């Protein structure tokens, strides 16, 4: 079912290579961890926040 | 609870072994495990010479 | 770039036989199947066959099996197709192409096709007659003049008018196969009526490929 | 053994304009179906290996997509390089097949045919057969046809024909038709007609002769 590629680098932009990873989210309603900064900033103290 | 096991301890030297230790003790949070599983049942494991 | 080049085209009379070959040229044949398809005049594109460069390994259509045998040599990086019993059916445009291994690819590398023709009457010049010209003119004020141009053998023939001088108001059909096994077309040239009878209007139809030409002379007669 | 089939049988298309082509095998054949592009004279040009793999050196303009079986080609913005035959091609299972090839058109001007009925010839009858000939001059639409008659009876199988190619700036043609008779039979029927007819005529066009005229 499978065929071997001729990847070559005497290929045009179409048929080079090309690395690809794929994120796919999770659709979980109670989810936790692969979680990033809300835009985080600096503390700031003595001024109304 | 909602796929989550949640785990709580305390471990003390005790004087008392036919009951468990008198007096207000509260256990410290250790976990919140996202494993998606129905728990009804339970075992323990010893190991074996 | 990789090509594919045909060669081994011709007639063979009927009940008999013919080779063709290409070459592979930029591209070594083994990986690949080299087939053989077939484009009879007015018909689409048919699959004759198929080899294994590589291996040796055959696959042939129905519609040829027990006459047309394939094979192909790496050392030479060639291949071959053996026609036998041909018959006038199997008049078509033989050509060459390519595959990946055994299939689910189409195929990439393409000759240009060799014409292989079966008939009964291999060799024979046209026979030309003139259309007379409506004596009543049409839309734009035009009449044409014509000729029929039949039995010939074989295809290609180019028709000009007035000996080539004339190619306005030329309008030319294509050549078909007829069931006399010689091909067939016809031609007029459309023009301000009365120059019909000013310019010179002959039928000039040329056939390279069988050493001959006909020059027939079509005027206007009474109509 | 797998076989497929295309339509339409031609497209009419204007330089600038989409292209849509079509071939629906009667087994899947997966997504193996490549395609070709041929102009007379030339081999066909691979376009297209499999549904959604085209070949390096093919226009961009070549595209496609499925639903279900049937696979939709086309081109997004036709050029004069690519008026040809496009033919469908499945690599799955033996024997190879192809598609029957899709004429593409460059869609000007509908016009009626001048109509032009040439009785046989003197010269032609000299060769013991007769060849009633008509011939449709600059038309279009791509199709047409004569209705042929002897006596004024609709005539059928007793015709011929060869068509012409489409002018560049008309995408008119003209059509060819001829009856034949052997000179004997012609000489036993009076009157011939050629009554022409095509997809944009709504008033057929009948010209018509005695027999012995012209």
């Known amino acids: 079912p499978l065929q071997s590629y001729g990847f070559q680098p005497t290929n045009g932009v179409g048929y080079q290579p090309y690395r690809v990873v794929v994120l796919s989210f999770e659709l979980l309603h109670a989810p936790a961890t692969v979680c990033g900064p809300k835009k985080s900033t600096n503390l700031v103290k003595n001024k109304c926040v | 609870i909602d796929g989550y096991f949640k785990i709580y301890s305390k471990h003390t030297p005790i004087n008392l072994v036919r009951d468990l230790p008198q007096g207000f003790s509260a256990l410290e949070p250790l976990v919140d495990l996202p494993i998606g599983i129905n728990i009804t049942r339970f075992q323990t494991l010893l190991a074996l010479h | 770039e990789v090509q594919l080049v045909e060669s081994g085209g011709g007639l063979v009379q009927p009940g008999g036989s013919l080779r063709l070959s290409c070459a592979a040229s930029g591209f070594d044949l083994g990986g690949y199947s080299m087939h053989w398809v077939r484009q009879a005049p007015g018909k689409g594109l048919e699959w004759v066959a198929g080899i294994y460069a590589s291996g040796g390994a055959t696959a042939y259509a129905d519609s040829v099996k027990g006459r047309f045998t394939i094979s192909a040599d790496t050392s030479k990086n060639t291949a071959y197709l053996q026609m036998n019993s041909l018959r006038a059916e199997d008049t078509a445009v033989y050509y060459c192409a390519r595959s990946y291994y055994y299939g689910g690819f189409g195929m990439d590398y393409w000759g240009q096709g060799t014409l292989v023709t079966v008939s009964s009457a291999s060799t024979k010049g046209p026979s030309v007659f003139p259309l007379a010209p409506s004596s009543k003119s049409t839309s734009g004020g035009t009449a044409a003049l014509g000729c029929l141009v039949k039995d010939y053998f074989p295809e290609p023939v180019t028709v000009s008018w007035n000996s080539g001088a004339l190619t306005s108001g030329v309008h030319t059909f294509p050549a078909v196969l007829q069931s006399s096994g010689l091909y067939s077309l016809s031609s007029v040239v459309t023009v301000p009526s009365s120059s019909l009878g000013t310019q010179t209007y002959i039928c000039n139809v040329n056939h390279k490929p069988s050493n001959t030409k006909v020059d027939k002379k079509v005027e206007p007669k009474s109509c | 053994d797998i076989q497929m089939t295309q339509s339409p049988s031609s497209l009419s298309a204007s330089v600038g304009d989409r292209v849509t082509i079509t071939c629906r095998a009667s087994?899947?054949?997966?997504?193996?179906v490549a395609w070709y592009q041929q102009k007379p004279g030339k081999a066909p040009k691979l376009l297209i290996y499999s549904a959604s793999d085209l070949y390096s050196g093919v226009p961009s303009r070549f595209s496609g997509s499925r639903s279900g079986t049937d696979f939709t080609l086309t081109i997004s913005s036709l050029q004069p390089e690519d008026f040809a035959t496009y033919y469908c091609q499945q690599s799955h299972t033996y024997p190879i097949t192809f598609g029957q090839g899709t004429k593409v058109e460059i869609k000007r001007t509908v016009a009626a045919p001048s109509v032009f009925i040439f009785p046989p010839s003197d010269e032609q009858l000299k060769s013991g057969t007769a060849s009633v000939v008509c011939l449709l001059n600059n038309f279009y639409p791509r199709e047409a046809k004569v209705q042929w008659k002897v006596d004024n009876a609709l005539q059928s199988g007793n015709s011929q024909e060869s068509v012409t190619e489409q002018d560049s700036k008309d995408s008119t043609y003209s059509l060819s038709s001829t009856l034949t008779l052997s000179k004997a039979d012609y000489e036993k029927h009076k009157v011939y007609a050629c009554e022409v007819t095509h997809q944009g005529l709504s008033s057929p066009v009948t010209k018509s002769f005695n027999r012995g005229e012209c």
């Open positions: 087994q899947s054949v997966s997504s193996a």
